Write a protein that binds this ligand. Structure first.
Ligand SMILES: [K+]
Ligand SMILES: [Mg+2]
Ligand SMILES: [Mg+2]
Lengths: 76, 45
């Protein structure tokens, strides 16, 4: 199935996933696409930050869902 | 400002929160949206 990840830097990332994908798996797919290290990534769905170890199915994330990507910042 | 109102809309979309809450997180983070969202998702512990 397809889900979308919207970044705050103007990209919508189109991913292929399964309900059984873990959040870590999704972050790895984002790294594949955009080069963003997983440790920087905060993935958000329906206003909540998604936790490593859970799956998309744990969060009831269905086909064509949009997730948001917020990056952790350094230097501030 | 128009620009700040747009930031509030975007913050509230990501956080799925009320506009007033978004505005205060933004203002308290110097109107820096990614910083404000980091604060929102990892508050003081
Ligand atoms: K929320
Ligand atoms: Mg497929
Ligand atoms: Mg890779």
């Amino acid at each position: 199935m397809q889900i979308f990840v919207k970044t705050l830097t103007g990209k919508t990332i189109t991913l292929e996933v399964e309900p059984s994908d873990t959040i870590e798996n999704v972050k790895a797919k984002i790294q594949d696409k955009e080069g963003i290290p997983p440790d920087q990534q905060r993935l958000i769905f329906a206003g909540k930050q998604l936790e490593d170890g859970r799956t998309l199915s744990d969060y009831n994330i269905q086909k064509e869902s949009t997730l948001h990507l917020v990056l952790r910042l350094r230097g501030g | 400002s128009n620009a700040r109102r747009l930031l509030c809309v975007e913050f509230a979309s990501v956080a799925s929160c009320d506009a007033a809450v978004a505005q205060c997180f933004l203002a308290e983070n110097d109107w820096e949206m990614e910083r404000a969202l980091n604060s929102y998702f990892e508050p003081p512990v």
